[PDB]
Amino acid sequence: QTNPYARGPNPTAASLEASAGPFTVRSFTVSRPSGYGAGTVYYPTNAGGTVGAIAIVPGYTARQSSIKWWGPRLASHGFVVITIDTNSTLDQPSSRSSQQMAALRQVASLNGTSSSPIYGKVDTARMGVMGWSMGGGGSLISAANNPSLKAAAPQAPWDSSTNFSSVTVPTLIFACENDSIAPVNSSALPIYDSMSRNAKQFLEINGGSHSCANSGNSNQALIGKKGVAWMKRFMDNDTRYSTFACENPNSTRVSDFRTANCSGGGGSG
């Protein structure tokens, strides 16, 4: 059967590493944010069907600028993306998760609002979560509390607990080798190791500082390829992306790679 959620052309490494995918992207700022501080919605104008929605949250003290690059990068491959500012820059992870879910709720509401640029563009049954540091911890909390989410891809995550063993959502963890804010061996890696009930992946950027996956980073080719491939594979069920999502990228830019329960296009063996 034709996968009803497949969008865009067959992927190549070059097309996933480029700065933009196939679709034209527009954006708007949310007029009256509902349950969070502010939001920018990125969306494809011509995806060829409804697409899933992804909500992205920054870390402590941080604002949309730190995570903004994901907006165009994901939306140009066929997603509606909302980046947010939290009610307070000093909100903790559980609050960030609530606000993340409120942003997804509002994307669904705008999909139903005839005046909105994303009217009828969203499949509100297919949602994902991303975010940086405390916003990454908030993404994992969102996944733990809302298992119908289709994918999570936090970056340099931190939470006051590293035990995310209840998560059944496919989760890709971006980590930064030299992170001194949320050190990998006390945060991102114990988080990754705690999850035994899901498809999961761990991708650590060689020499990365705590901001190694943020706007302006020097690995947008690899990080953007992996984020889009993960979201395509698991939010769209798009098996064209099974290998890009699950495979070791064999990159000089990677200082650790792990994956579990990720079938990468090799049959049953």
Coordinates of C-alpha atoms in Angstrom, one line a residue:
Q1 CA 0.0 0.0 0.0
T2 CA 1.1 3.6 -0.6
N3 CA 2.0 5.0 2.7
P4 CA -0.5 7.9 3.1
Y5 CA 2.0 9.9 5.1
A6 CA 5.0 9.7 2.8
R7 CA 6.0 13.2 1.5
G8 CA 8.6 14.4 -0.8
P9 CA 11.2 12.7 -3.1
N10 CA 13.2 9.7 -2.2
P11 CA 16.0 10.8 0.2
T12 CA 19.7 10.9 -0.5
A13 CA 22.6 11.7 1.8
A14 CA 23.1 15.0 -0.2
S15 CA 19.5 16.0 0.0
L16 CA 19.3 15.3 3.7
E17 CA 22.6 17.2 4.4
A18 CA 21.6 20.3 2.4
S19 CA 20.4 23.4 4.2
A20 CA 16.8 22.9 3.0
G21 CA 14.6 20.1 1.9
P22 CA 12.2 20.2 -1.1
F23 CA 9.3 22.3 0.3
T24 CA 8.9 26.1 0.4
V25 CA 8.7 27.3 4.0
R26 CA 6.8 30.2 5.6
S27 CA 6.4 31.2 9.2
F28 CA 4.2 33.3 11.5
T29 CA 4.4 34.3 15.2
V30 CA 1.5 33.2 17.3
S31 CA -0.9 36.1 18.1
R32 CA -2.2 34.9 21.5
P33 CA 0.0 32.0 22.9
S34 CA -2.1 29.6 24.9
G35 CA -0.2 28.1 27.8
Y36 CA 3.4 29.2 26.9
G37 CA 5.2 32.5 26.4
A38 CA 5.6 33.0 22.7
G39 CA 5.8 30.9 19.5
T40 CA 6.9 30.9 15.9
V41 CA 5.2 28.4 13.6
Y42 CA 7.2 27.2 10.5
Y43 CA 5.3 25.3 7.8
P44 CA 5.6 24.0 4.2
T45 CA 3.5 25.7 1.7
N46 CA 3.4 22.7 -0.8
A47 CA 4.0 19.4 1.1
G48 CA 1.4 17.5 -1.0
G49 CA -0.7 16.4 2.0
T50 CA -1.1 17.0 5.7
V51 CA 2.0 16.7 7.8
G52 CA 2.9 16.1 11.4
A53 CA 3.7 18.8 14.0
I54 CA 6.8 19.2 16.2
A55 CA 7.2 21.4 19.2
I56 CA 10.7 22.6 20.2
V57 CA 11.7 24.2 23.6
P58 CA 14.9 26.0 24.6
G59 CA 16.9 25.5 27.8
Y60 CA 17.3 27.6 31.0
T61 CA 17.6 31.4 30.2
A62 CA 17.3 30.6 26.5
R63 CA 14.9 31.8 23.9
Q64 CA 13.7 30.7 20.4
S65 CA 17.0 31.9 18.8
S66 CA 18.9 28.9 20.2
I67 CA 16.6 26.4 18.5
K68 CA 15.3 28.4 15.6
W69 CA 17.3 26.6 12.9
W70 CA 15.2 23.5 13.3
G71 CA 12.2 25.4 12.1
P72 CA 13.1 25.8 8.5
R73 CA 15.2 22.7 8.3
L74 CA 12.3 20.4 9.4
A75 CA 9.5 22.3 7.8
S76 CA 11.2 22.2 4.4
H77 CA 11.1 18.4 4.6
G78 CA 7.3 18.3 5.4
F79 CA 6.6 19.2 9.0
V80 CA 4.8 22.0 10.9
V81 CA 7.2 23.2 13.6
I82 CA 6.5 25.4 16.5
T83 CA 9.5 26.9 18.4
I84 CA 8.7 28.4 21.7
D85 CA 9.6 30.8 24.4
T86 CA 8.6 29.7 27.9
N87 CA 6.4 31.7 30.3
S88 CA 9.6 32.4 32.3
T89 CA 13.2 31.9 31.1
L90 CA 13.8 30.2 34.4
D91 CA 11.1 27.5 34.1
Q92 CA 12.1 24.0 35.0
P93 CA 11.7 20.8 32.9
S94 CA 8.3 19.7 34.0
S95 CA 6.9 23.2 33.2
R96 CA 8.7 23.2 29.9
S97 CA 7.0 19.9 29.1
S98 CA 3.6 21.3 29.9
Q99 CA 4.3 24.3 27.7
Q100 CA 5.6 22.1 24.9
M101 CA 2.3 20.2 25.0
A102 CA 0.4 23.4 25.1
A103 CA 2.2 24.6 22.0
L104 CA 1.2 21.3 20.2
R105 CA -2.3 21.8 21.4
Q106 CA -2.4 25.3 19.9
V107 CA -0.9 24.1 16.6
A108 CA -3.8 21.7 16.4
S109 CA -6.2 24.5 17.2
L110 CA -4.7 26.7 14.5
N111 CA -5.1 23.8 12.0
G112 CA -8.8 24.2 12.6
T113 CA -8.8 28.1 12.4
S114 CA -9.8 29.3 8.9
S115 CA -7.8 32.5 9.2
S116 CA -4.5 30.7 10.1
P117 CA -1.8 30.0 7.5
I118 CA -1.7 26.4 8.7
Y119 CA -5.5 25.8 8.3
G120 CA -5.9 22.2 7.2
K121 CA -2.1 21.6 6.9
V122 CA -1.6 19.5 10.0
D123 CA -2.3 15.9 10.8
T124 CA -3.1 16.5 14.5
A125 CA -2.7 12.8 15.3
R126 CA 1.0 12.8 14.5
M127 CA 3.2 14.9 16.8
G128 CA 6.8 15.0 18.0
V129 CA 8.9 16.8 20.6
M130 CA 12.4 18.4 20.6
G131 CA 14.3 20.7 22.8
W132 CA 17.6 21.8 24.3
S133 CA 18.9 20.9 27.8
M134 CA 16.1 21.5 30.2
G135 CA 13.9 21.7 27.1
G136 CA 15.3 18.3 26.1
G137 CA 14.4 16.9 29.5
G138 CA 11.0 18.5 29.0
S139 CA 10.7 16.6 25.7
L140 CA 11.4 13.3 27.4
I141 CA 8.9 14.1 30.1
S142 CA 6.4 14.9 27.4
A143 CA 7.1 11.5 25.8
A144 CA 6.8 9.7 29.1
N145 CA 3.5 11.4 29.8
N146 CA 2.1 11.2 26.3
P147 CA 3.0 7.9 24.6
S148 CA 0.9 8.7 21.5
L149 CA 3.7 11.1 20.5
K150 CA 5.4 9.6 17.5
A151 CA 9.0 10.7 18.0
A152 CA 11.3 12.6 20.3
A153 CA 14.7 14.1 19.4
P154 CA 16.1 16.2 22.3
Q155 CA 19.5 17.7 22.3
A156 CA 22.0 17.9 25.2
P157 CA 19.1 16.9 27.6
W158 CA 19.0 17.6 31.3
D159 CA 16.4 16.7 33.9
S160 CA 16.7 16.4 37.7
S161 CA 16.1 12.6 37.1
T162 CA 17.9 10.5 34.5
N163 CA 15.4 7.6 34.7
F164 CA 13.2 7.7 31.5
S165 CA 12.6 3.9 31.5
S166 CA 8.9 4.3 30.9
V167 CA 9.4 6.0 27.5
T168 CA 7.9 4.0 24.6
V169 CA 8.3 6.8 22.0
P170 CA 11.2 6.5 19.5
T171 CA 13.8 8.8 20.9
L172 CA 17.0 10.1 19.3
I173 CA 19.4 11.8 21.8
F174 CA 21.8 14.4 20.4
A175 CA 24.7 14.8 22.9
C176 CA 27.8 17.0 22.9
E177 CA 31.1 15.4 23.8
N178 CA 32.6 18.2 25.9
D179 CA 29.4 19.5 27.5
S180 CA 30.2 21.1 30.8
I181 CA 26.7 22.3 31.6
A182 CA 25.0 19.0 31.3
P183 CA 27.9 16.6 31.1
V184 CA 27.2 13.6 28.9
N185 CA 28.2 11.0 31.4
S186 CA 25.9 12.4 34.1
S187 CA 23.0 13.5 31.9
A188 CA 22.5 12.5 28.2
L189 CA 24.1 9.0 28.5
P190 CA 22.3 7.9 31.7
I191 CA 19.1 9.1 30.1
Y192 CA 19.8 7.1 27.0
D193 CA 20.8 4.0 29.0
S194 CA 17.6 4.1 31.1
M195 CA 15.3 3.6 28.1
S196 CA 14.6 -0.1 27.4
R197 CA 11.1 0.0 25.9
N198 CA 11.7 2.0 22.7
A199 CA 13.5 2.5 19.5
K200 CA 16.4 4.8 20.5
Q201 CA 19.6 6.3 19.3
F202 CA 22.5 8.2 20.9
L203 CA 24.6 10.5 18.7
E204 CA 27.4 12.4 20.4
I205 CA 29.1 15.3 18.5
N206 CA 32.9 15.1 18.7
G207 CA 34.3 18.1 20.6
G208 CA 30.9 19.6 21.0
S209 CA 30.1 22.2 23.7
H210 CA 26.7 22.4 25.3
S211 CA 25.4 24.4 22.3
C212 CA 26.6 21.9 19.7
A213 CA 23.1 21.3 18.2
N214 CA 21.9 25.0 18.4
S215 CA 21.4 27.5 15.7
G216 CA 24.6 28.3 13.9
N217 CA 26.3 25.1 14.9
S218 CA 29.0 23.6 12.7
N219 CA 27.3 20.2 12.1
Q220 CA 24.0 21.2 10.6
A221 CA 24.6 18.7 7.7
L222 CA 24.9 15.7 10.0
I223 CA 22.6 16.9 12.8
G224 CA 19.9 18.1 10.4
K225 CA 20.1 14.9 8.3
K226 CA 19.7 12.8 11.5
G227 CA 16.9 14.9 12.9
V228 CA 14.9 14.9 9.7
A229 CA 15.5 11.2 9.0
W230 CA 14.4 10.3 12.6
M231 CA 11.2 12.4 12.3
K232 CA 10.5 11.0 8.8
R233 CA 10.9 7.4 9.9
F234 CA 8.8 7.6 13.0
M235 CA 6.3 10.4 12.5
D236 CA 5.5 9.5 8.9
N237 CA 6.2 5.7 9.3
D238 CA 8.4 6.3 6.2
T239 CA 10.5 3.3 5.7
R240 CA 12.5 5.1 3.0
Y241 CA 14.2 6.5 6.0
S242 CA 14.8 3.4 8.0
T243 CA 18.5 3.3 7.0
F244 CA 19.2 7.0 7.4
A245 CA 17.4 6.9 10.8
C246 CA 19.0 3.8 12.2
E247 CA 22.4 3.6 10.6
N248 CA 25.7 4.7 12.1
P249 CA 26.6 7.8 10.0
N250 CA 30.3 6.7 10.1
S251 CA 31.2 10.4 10.5
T252 CA 34.5 11.9 11.7
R253 CA 32.2 14.4 13.6
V254 CA 30.9 11.7 15.9
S255 CA 32.5 10.6 19.2
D256 CA 29.8 8.2 20.2
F257 CA 27.0 6.3 18.5
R258 CA 24.5 3.8 20.0
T259 CA 21.2 2.5 18.8
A260 CA 18.6 -0.1 19.9
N261 CA 15.4 -1.5 18.5
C262 CA 16.1 0.4 15.3
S263 CA 15.8 -1.8 12.2
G264 CA 18.0 -0.3 9.5
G265 CA 16.9 -1.9 6.3
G266 CA 18.6 -5.3 6.7
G267 CA 15.7 -7.7 6.8
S268 CA 15.2 -9.9 9.8
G269 CA 18.9 -10.4 10.5

